[PDB]
Amino acid sequence: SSVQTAATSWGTVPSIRVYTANNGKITERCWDGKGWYTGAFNEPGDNVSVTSWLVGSAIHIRVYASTGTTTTEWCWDGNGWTKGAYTATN
């Protein structure tokens, strides 16, 4: 299996975030208009998806990181990554 990516963007600049799962680790590369840099997001995963929405001045990002049959939602809401309430079943 090749590395696996997920991408999202917001605004008009725009800002872009690209998440890459490589050998069980997801890392984050960021564009905010002038140069790519490495973002804070660094969590385990073989598979990744992402969605985002911009409300006011805060970007809200949800990254779904999967290893085996376990999917962990990671949340950015303008001030730090947290593990969210998402579960795959009740």
Added chain:
Amino acid sequence: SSVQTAATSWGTVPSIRVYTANNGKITERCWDGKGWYTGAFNEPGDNVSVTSWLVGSAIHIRVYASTGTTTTEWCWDGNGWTKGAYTATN
């Protein structure tokens, strides 16, 4: 291979949908502001992607479900899932 996900979101609440392909079946988990629940979407797939757009009061969702070399588009347009016109070639 780990489970594989795809995510989309809309509005300001927001609403989120997360599709998970697990052992050949795609299922759907939904957030509309207070609690995750299991959505109606339940179709075959080893791979999934999604996109969506909100027009008026109706969310329009397109889920691309793949098994082997066959990709099936599933459509939500506010009142039920249907298999759409998408084909991978003419």
Added chain:
Amino acid sequence: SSVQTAATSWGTVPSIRVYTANNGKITERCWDGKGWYTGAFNEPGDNVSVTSWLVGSAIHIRVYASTGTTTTEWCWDGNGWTKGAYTATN
């Protein structure tokens, strides 16, 4: 491994683009309101993700194509595909 897809959409029509990685090649299917057609995008990849944003009359698309541990960003900015500045590390 089944084929792998990524999808994006824009506008109200809407326009949809679906990228499919199949046997190391990514191809593109397009909807702009009346019929699916094959788009110009044709580049190597085992994995694909996409994001897009509409500014003025130009759609801007970013397709992240991965083979092995190499991820190539492809950019549409209204007048042709180009390989962008994205790198996975500095």
